[PDB]
Protein backbone atom coordinates (compact mmCIF):
# COMPACT_ATOMS: atom_id res chain seq x y z
CA UNK A 1 0.00 0.00 0.00
CA UNK A 2 1.62 3.22 -1.19
CA UNK A 3 0.80 6.83 -0.30
CA UNK A 4 2.17 10.25 0.69
CA UNK A 5 1.88 11.87 4.12
CA UNK A 6 3.86 14.54 5.96
CA UNK A 7 6.82 13.65 8.21
CA UNK A 8 5.05 14.09 11.56
CA UNK A 9 2.30 11.70 10.47
CA UNK A 10 4.63 8.80 9.75
CA UNK A 11 4.23 7.65 13.35
CA UNK A 12 0.50 7.21 12.69
CA UNK A 13 1.16 4.44 10.20
CA UNK A 14 1.29 1.76 12.86
CA UNK A 15 -0.94 -0.53 14.98
CA UNK A 16 -2.73 1.16 17.88
CA UNK A 17 -2.38 4.71 16.56
CA UNK A 18 -4.87 7.56 16.43
CA UNK A 19 -4.99 10.84 14.53
CA UNK A 20 -6.26 12.26 11.27
CA UNK A 21 -4.38 9.71 9.21
CA UNK A 22 -4.80 6.70 11.44
CA UNK A 23 -8.53 7.38 11.81
CA UNK A 24 -9.72 8.94 8.54
CA UNK A 25 -7.23 7.93 5.86
CA UNK A 26 -5.19 4.79 6.41
CA UNK A 27 -5.91 2.43 9.27
CA UNK A 28 -3.77 -0.55 10.28
CA UNK A 29 -5.26 -3.37 12.41
CA UNK A 30 -4.00 -4.06 15.92
CA UNK A 31 -2.95 -7.55 14.81
CA UNK A 32 -1.22 -6.20 11.71
CA UNK A 33 1.57 -8.30 10.28
CA UNK A 34 3.84 -6.51 7.84
CA UNK A 35 6.42 -3.74 7.45
CA UNK A 36 5.99 0.02 7.24
CA UNK A 37 8.62 1.62 5.06
CA UNK A 38 9.00 5.36 4.60
CA UNK A 39 11.45 7.85 3.18
CA UNK A 40 11.80 11.58 2.73
CA UNK A 41 10.65 12.67 -0.71
CA UNK A 42 11.12 16.44 -0.37
CA UNK A 43 12.99 16.46 -3.67
CA UNK A 44 10.10 14.83 -5.52
CA UNK A 45 6.78 15.74 -3.95
CA UNK A 46 7.43 19.39 -3.09
CA UNK A 47 7.45 22.43 -5.33
CA UNK A 48 7.90 26.17 -5.12
CA UNK A 49 4.55 27.74 -4.31
CA UNK A 50 3.34 24.49 -2.72
CA UNK A 51 2.34 21.08 -4.05
CA UNK A 52 -1.42 20.77 -3.65
CA UNK A 53 -1.82 17.43 -5.41
CA UNK A 54 -1.57 15.50 -2.16
CA UNK A 55 -4.75 15.38 -0.12
CA UNK A 56 -5.82 13.87 3.16
CA UNK A 57 -9.15 13.45 4.89
CA UNK A 58 -9.61 15.90 7.72
CA UNK A 59 -13.21 15.17 8.68
CA UNK A 60 -15.25 11.99 8.80
CA UNK A 61 -18.39 10.77 10.58
CA UNK A 62 -16.51 7.83 12.07
CA UNK A 63 -13.15 6.08 12.12
CA UNK A 64 -12.09 3.78 9.30
CA UNK A 65 -11.91 0.04 9.59
CA UNK A 66 -8.49 -1.56 8.94
CA UNK A 67 -7.58 -1.26 5.26
CA UNK A 68 -10.77 0.66 4.47
CA UNK A 69 -10.45 3.17 1.63
CA UNK A 70 -12.86 6.12 1.71
CA UNK A 71 -12.56 8.40 -1.32
CA UNK A 72 -15.86 10.27 -1.09
CA UNK A 73 -15.99 14.07 -1.12
CA UNK A 74 -19.39 14.59 0.50
CA UNK A 75 -19.74 17.63 2.72
CA UNK A 76 -19.17 16.87 6.39
CA UNK A 77 -21.88 17.91 8.81
CA UNK A 78 -20.30 19.28 11.96
CA UNK A 79 -23.47 20.77 13.39
CA UNK A 80 -27.06 19.57 13.72
CA UNK A 81 -28.24 21.21 10.50
CA UNK A 82 -28.14 19.25 7.18
CA UNK A 83 -25.64 20.67 4.67
CA UNK A 84 -27.49 19.52 1.56
CA UNK A 85 -24.20 19.38 -0.36
CA UNK A 86 -23.34 23.02 0.35
CA UNK A 87 -20.34 23.91 2.49
CA UNK A 88 -20.49 26.80 4.94
CA UNK A 89 -21.00 27.24 8.66
CA UNK A 90 -20.77 23.81 10.33
CA UNK A 91 -20.47 22.25 6.82
CA UNK A 92 -16.95 21.36 5.80
CA UNK A 93 -15.20 20.03 2.75
CA UNK A 94 -13.75 16.75 4.13
CA UNK A 95 -10.39 16.92 2.36
CA UNK A 96 -7.38 19.19 2.75
CA UNK A 97 -4.02 19.55 0.99
CA UNK A 98 -0.57 19.30 2.49
CA UNK A 99 0.73 22.04 0.21
CA UNK B 1 -0.85 29.68 32.84
CA UNK B 2 2.80 28.80 33.09
CA UNK B 3 3.38 25.07 33.39
CA UNK B 4 4.91 25.45 36.85
CA UNK B 5 1.74 27.22 37.95
CA UNK B 6 -0.88 25.50 35.80
CA UNK B 7 -4.51 26.57 36.00
CA UNK B 8 -7.20 24.12 37.08
CA UNK B 9 -10.80 24.66 35.98
CA UNK B 10 -13.48 22.57 37.69
CA UNK B 11 -16.34 21.50 35.42
CA UNK B 12 -19.64 20.17 36.80
CA UNK B 13 -23.42 20.03 36.36
CA UNK B 14 -23.41 20.34 32.55
CA UNK B 15 -23.57 18.57 29.19
CA UNK B 16 -20.16 17.66 27.84
CA UNK B 17 -19.91 17.34 24.08
CA UNK B 18 -16.44 16.01 23.38
CA UNK B 19 -17.00 15.58 19.65
CA UNK B 20 -16.70 19.31 19.13
CA UNK B 21 -13.16 19.07 20.45
CA UNK B 22 -12.21 15.66 19.08
CA UNK B 23 -13.41 16.26 15.54
CA UNK B 24 -11.70 19.65 15.44
CA UNK B 25 -9.00 20.24 12.84
CA UNK B 26 -7.34 22.79 15.08
CA UNK B 27 -5.56 20.49 17.54
CA UNK B 28 -2.25 18.75 16.87
CA UNK B 29 -2.50 16.40 19.83
CA UNK B 30 -5.57 14.67 21.20
CA UNK B 31 -4.61 11.62 23.23
CA UNK B 32 -7.08 9.89 25.56
CA UNK B 33 -6.09 7.53 28.34
CA UNK B 34 -8.35 5.08 30.17
CA UNK B 35 -11.10 5.98 27.72
CA UNK B 36 -11.83 5.95 24.00
CA UNK B 37 -12.05 9.41 22.33
CA UNK B 38 -15.11 8.22 20.41
CA UNK B 39 -17.02 6.88 23.42
CA UNK B 40 -16.77 10.03 25.51
CA UNK B 41 -20.26 11.24 24.62
CA UNK B 42 -21.73 8.00 25.96
CA UNK B 43 -20.18 8.45 29.40
CA UNK B 44 -21.09 10.34 32.57
CA UNK B 45 -18.55 11.66 35.07
CA UNK B 46 -18.74 12.99 38.61
CA UNK B 47 -16.43 15.84 37.64
CA UNK B 48 -14.13 17.04 34.90
CA UNK B 49 -10.98 19.05 35.53
CA UNK B 50 -9.52 21.13 32.73
Amino acid at each position, epitope marked *: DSFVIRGDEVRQIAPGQTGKIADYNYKLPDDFTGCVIAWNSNNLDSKV*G*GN*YNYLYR*L*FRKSNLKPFERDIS*TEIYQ*AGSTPCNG*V*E*G*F*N*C*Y*FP*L*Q*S*Y*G | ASVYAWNRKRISNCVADYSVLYN*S*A*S*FSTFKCYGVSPTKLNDLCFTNVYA
Partner: antibody
Amino acid sequence: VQLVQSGAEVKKPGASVKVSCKASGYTFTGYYMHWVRQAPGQGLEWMGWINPISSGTSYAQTFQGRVTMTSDTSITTAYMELSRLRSDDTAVYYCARAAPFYDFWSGYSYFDYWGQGTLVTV
Amino acid sequence: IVMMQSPGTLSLSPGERATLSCRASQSVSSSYLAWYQQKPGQAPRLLIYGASSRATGIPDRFSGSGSGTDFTLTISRLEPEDFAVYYCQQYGSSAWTFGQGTKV
Protein backbone atom coordinates in the same frame (compact mmCIF):
# COMPACT_ATOMS: atom_id res chain seq x y z
CA VAL C 1 1.89 36.01 3.95
CA GLN C 2 1.47 38.08 0.77
CA LEU C 3 -1.49 38.73 -1.51
CA VAL C 4 -0.73 40.28 -4.88
CA GLN C 5 -3.51 41.48 -7.14
CA SER C 6 -3.63 42.45 -10.81
CA GLY C 7 -3.45 46.05 -12.01
CA ALA C 8 -6.32 48.51 -12.49
CA GLU C 9 -8.92 47.99 -15.20
CA VAL C 10 -11.24 50.24 -17.19
CA LYS C 11 -14.45 48.73 -18.55
CA LYS C 12 -17.61 49.88 -20.27
CA PRO C 13 -21.07 49.20 -18.76
CA GLY C 14 -22.24 45.69 -19.64
CA ALA C 15 -18.65 44.41 -19.76
CA SER C 16 -17.07 41.87 -17.42
CA VAL C 17 -13.89 42.20 -15.36
CA LYS C 18 -11.72 39.46 -13.90
CA VAL C 19 -9.50 40.42 -10.98
CA SER C 20 -6.78 37.99 -9.92
CA CYS C 21 -5.04 37.54 -6.55
CA LYS C 22 -1.85 35.52 -6.23
CA ALA C 23 -1.19 34.19 -2.75
CA SER C 24 2.07 33.15 -1.15
CA GLY C 25 3.68 32.44 2.22
CA TYR C 26 1.01 29.97 3.34
CA THR C 27 -0.91 26.84 2.40
CA PHE C 28 -3.24 28.22 -0.25
CA THR C 29 -5.99 25.67 0.26
CA GLY C 30 -5.86 26.08 4.03
CA TYR C 31 -7.75 29.37 3.85
CA TYR C 32 -10.81 30.94 2.29
CA MET C 33 -10.26 33.73 -0.18
CA HIS C 34 -12.69 36.59 0.23
CA TRP C 35 -13.34 39.57 -1.96
CA VAL C 36 -14.23 42.97 -0.54
CA ARG C 37 -15.31 46.02 -2.53
CA GLN C 38 -14.79 49.68 -1.68
CA ALA C 39 -16.57 52.27 -3.82
CA PRO C 40 -15.06 55.82 -3.79
CA GLY C 41 -15.97 57.63 -0.57
CA GLN C 42 -17.61 54.48 0.80
CA GLY C 43 -16.80 51.77 3.32
CA LEU C 44 -15.98 48.11 2.81
CA GLU C 45 -18.50 45.67 1.32
CA TRP C 46 -18.13 41.90 1.43
CA MET C 47 -18.79 40.19 -1.91
CA GLY C 48 -18.23 36.50 -1.27
CA TRP C 49 -15.57 33.82 -0.88
CA ILE C 50 -14.04 30.80 -2.55
CA ASN C 51 -12.56 27.71 -0.92
CA PRO C 52 -9.66 26.66 -3.25
CA ILE C 53 -9.62 23.06 -2.01
CA SER C 54 -13.01 22.40 -3.60
CA SER C 55 -13.68 25.71 -5.33
CA GLY C 56 -16.90 25.95 -3.37
CA THR C 57 -18.22 29.50 -3.15
CA SER C 58 -20.64 31.76 -1.36
CA TYR C 59 -21.82 35.19 -2.42
CA ALA C 60 -23.55 38.17 -0.88
CA GLN C 61 -27.13 38.55 -2.12
CA THR C 62 -26.01 41.89 -3.54
CA PHE C 63 -23.62 40.30 -6.04
CA GLN C 64 -25.08 36.82 -6.30
CA GLY C 65 -25.96 36.13 -9.93
CA ARG C 66 -23.38 38.60 -11.23
CA VAL C 67 -20.15 37.47 -9.61
CA THR C 68 -18.34 34.19 -10.16
CA MET C 69 -15.28 33.20 -8.16
CA THR C 70 -12.75 30.63 -9.30
CA SER C 71 -9.27 29.53 -8.30
CA ASP C 72 -6.27 27.55 -9.46
CA THR C 73 -4.21 25.91 -6.75
CA SER C 74 -1.35 25.06 -9.10
CA ILE C 75 -0.47 28.76 -9.24
CA THR C 76 -2.04 29.62 -5.88
CA THR C 77 -4.22 32.25 -7.54
CA ALA C 78 -7.81 33.27 -6.86
CA TYR C 79 -10.05 35.04 -9.36
CA MET C 80 -13.16 37.18 -9.09
CA GLU C 81 -15.17 37.82 -12.23
CA LEU C 82 -17.92 40.44 -12.03
CA SER C 83 -20.26 40.47 -15.02
CA ARG C 84 -22.81 43.00 -16.27
CA LEU C 85 -20.78 45.88 -14.86
CA ARG C 86 -22.69 49.04 -14.03
CA SER C 87 -21.46 52.58 -13.40
CA ASP C 88 -22.02 52.09 -9.67
CA ASP C 89 -19.58 49.18 -9.66
CA THR C 90 -16.68 51.61 -9.84
CA ALA C 91 -14.66 50.55 -6.83
CA VAL C 92 -11.42 49.26 -5.44
CA TYR C 93 -11.53 45.48 -5.15
CA TYR C 94 -9.52 43.69 -2.49
CA CYS C 95 -8.74 40.03 -1.93
CA ALA C 96 -8.50 39.00 1.69
CA ARG C 97 -7.59 35.87 3.59
CA ALA C 98 -9.63 34.28 6.37
CA ALA C 99 -9.68 30.89 8.07
CA PRO C 100 -12.13 28.18 6.91
CA PHE C 101 -15.36 27.59 8.81
CA TYR C 102 -13.84 24.67 10.67
CA ASP C 103 -11.36 26.87 12.51
CA PHE C 104 -11.88 26.28 16.22
CA TRP C 105 -11.07 29.84 17.26
CA SER C 106 -13.33 31.50 14.71
CA GLY C 107 -10.58 32.77 12.42
CA TYR C 108 -13.21 32.79 9.69
CA SER C 109 -15.08 35.64 11.33
CA TYR C 110 -12.46 38.16 10.22
CA PHE C 111 -9.93 38.88 7.49
CA ASP C 112 -6.32 38.82 8.65
CA TYR C 113 -4.53 39.54 5.38
CA TRP C 114 -5.37 41.86 2.51
CA GLY C 115 -3.90 42.39 -0.95
CA GLN C 116 -3.38 45.76 -2.57
CA GLY C 117 -6.62 47.18 -3.85
CA THR C 118 -7.37 46.90 -7.55
CA LEU C 119 -9.30 49.79 -9.04
CA VAL C 120 -11.99 48.98 -11.57
CA THR C 121 -13.59 51.90 -13.40
CA VAL C 122 -16.99 51.56 -15.13
CA ILE D 1 -27.48 43.51 10.55
CA VAL D 2 -26.42 47.16 10.83
CA MET D 3 -23.06 48.15 12.30
CA MET D 4 -23.01 51.82 13.25
CA GLN D 5 -19.80 53.61 14.22
CA SER D 6 -19.45 56.90 16.08
CA PRO D 7 -18.31 59.62 15.85
CA GLY D 8 -18.16 59.86 12.06
CA THR D 9 -15.14 62.10 12.58
CA LEU D 10 -12.77 62.05 15.54
CA SER D 11 -10.32 64.91 16.01
CA LEU D 12 -7.69 65.21 18.72
CA SER D 13 -3.98 65.85 19.20
CA PRO D 14 -1.19 63.26 18.77
CA GLY D 15 -0.04 61.84 22.10
CA GLU D 16 -3.60 61.81 23.43
CA ARG D 17 -6.10 58.96 23.76
CA ALA D 18 -8.94 58.23 21.34
CA THR D 19 -12.02 56.07 21.78
CA LEU D 20 -13.93 54.72 18.80
CA SER D 21 -17.37 53.17 19.22
CA CYS D 22 -19.35 50.62 17.19
CA ARG D 23 -22.96 49.77 17.97
CA ALA D 24 -24.89 46.80 16.64
CA SER D 25 -28.59 46.63 15.79
CA GLN D 26 -28.52 43.20 17.44
CA SER D 27 -26.25 41.32 19.83
CA VAL D 28 -22.92 40.26 18.34
CA SER D 29 -20.70 37.54 19.76
CA SER D 30 -17.43 39.02 20.95
CA SER D 31 -15.67 36.34 18.91
CA TYR D 32 -17.20 37.79 15.74
CA LEU D 33 -16.26 41.46 16.20
CA ALA D 34 -13.15 42.89 14.54
CA TRP D 35 -11.54 46.29 13.95
CA TYR D 36 -9.63 47.40 10.85
CA GLN D 37 -7.32 50.34 10.06
CA GLN D 38 -7.16 51.86 6.60
CA LYS D 39 -4.55 54.46 5.77
CA PRO D 40 -5.21 56.66 2.68
CA GLY D 41 -4.21 54.83 -0.50
CA GLN D 42 -3.75 51.53 1.35
CA ALA D 43 -5.68 48.31 1.90
CA PRO D 44 -7.33 47.75 5.34
CA ARG D 45 -5.32 45.86 7.93
CA LEU D 46 -6.58 43.90 10.91
CA LEU D 47 -6.02 45.46 14.31
CA ILE D 48 -8.39 43.70 16.68
CA TYR D 49 -10.24 40.41 16.38
CA GLY D 50 -12.48 38.58 18.81
CA ALA D 51 -13.44 42.00 20.22
CA SER D 52 -10.20 42.36 22.19
CA SER D 53 -7.34 40.34 20.64
CA ARG D 54 -4.55 42.15 18.83
CA ALA D 55 -3.49 40.98 15.40
CA THR D 56 0.14 40.05 14.85
CA GLY D 57 2.29 43.12 14.21
CA ILE D 58 -0.09 45.47 16.02
CA PRO D 59 1.34 47.77 18.77
CA ASP D 60 0.08 47.34 22.33
CA ARG D 61 -1.19 50.91 22.11
CA PHE D 62 -4.25 49.38 20.47
CA SER D 63 -6.88 47.53 22.46
CA GLY D 64 -10.49 46.52 22.07
CA SER D 65 -13.33 45.64 24.40
CA GLY D 66 -17.08 45.22 24.60
CA SER D 67 -19.92 42.75 24.17
CA GLY D 68 -23.50 42.47 23.00
CA THR D 69 -24.33 45.60 21.02
CA ASP D 70 -21.58 47.91 22.27
CA PHE D 71 -17.93 47.57 21.25
CA THR D 72 -15.04 50.02 21.36
CA LEU D 73 -11.52 50.49 20.03
CA THR D 74 -9.05 52.43 22.13
CA ILE D 75 -5.77 54.02 21.14
CA SER D 76 -3.91 54.83 24.36
CA ARG D 77 -1.50 57.21 22.64
CA LEU D 78 -1.99 58.45 19.10
CA GLU D 79 0.94 58.56 16.72
CA PRO D 80 0.93 60.36 13.31
CA GLU D 81 0.31 56.98 11.66
CA ASP D 82 -2.88 56.43 13.66
CA PHE D 83 -4.77 59.24 11.97
CA ALA D 84 -6.56 56.94 9.55
CA VAL D 85 -9.99 55.46 8.91
CA TYR D 86 -11.15 52.72 11.25
CA TYR D 87 -13.85 50.14 10.63
CA CYS D 88 -15.73 47.66 12.77
CA GLN D 89 -16.63 44.32 11.23
CA GLN D 90 -19.11 41.67 12.27
CA TYR D 91 -19.68 38.08 11.27
CA GLY D 92 -23.00 36.28 11.42
CA SER D 93 -25.69 34.62 9.31
CA SER D 94 -22.89 33.36 7.05
CA ALA D 95 -22.09 36.95 6.08
CA TRP D 96 -19.53 39.63 6.83
CA THR D 97 -20.68 43.18 7.50
CA PHE D 98 -18.63 46.35 7.90
CA GLY D 99 -19.55 49.63 9.58
CA GLN D 100 -19.46 52.91 7.66
CA GLY D 101 -16.04 53.72 9.13
CA THR D 102 -14.79 56.69 11.12
CA LYS D 103 -11.89 59.03 10.41
CA VAL D 104 -9.27 59.86 13.09
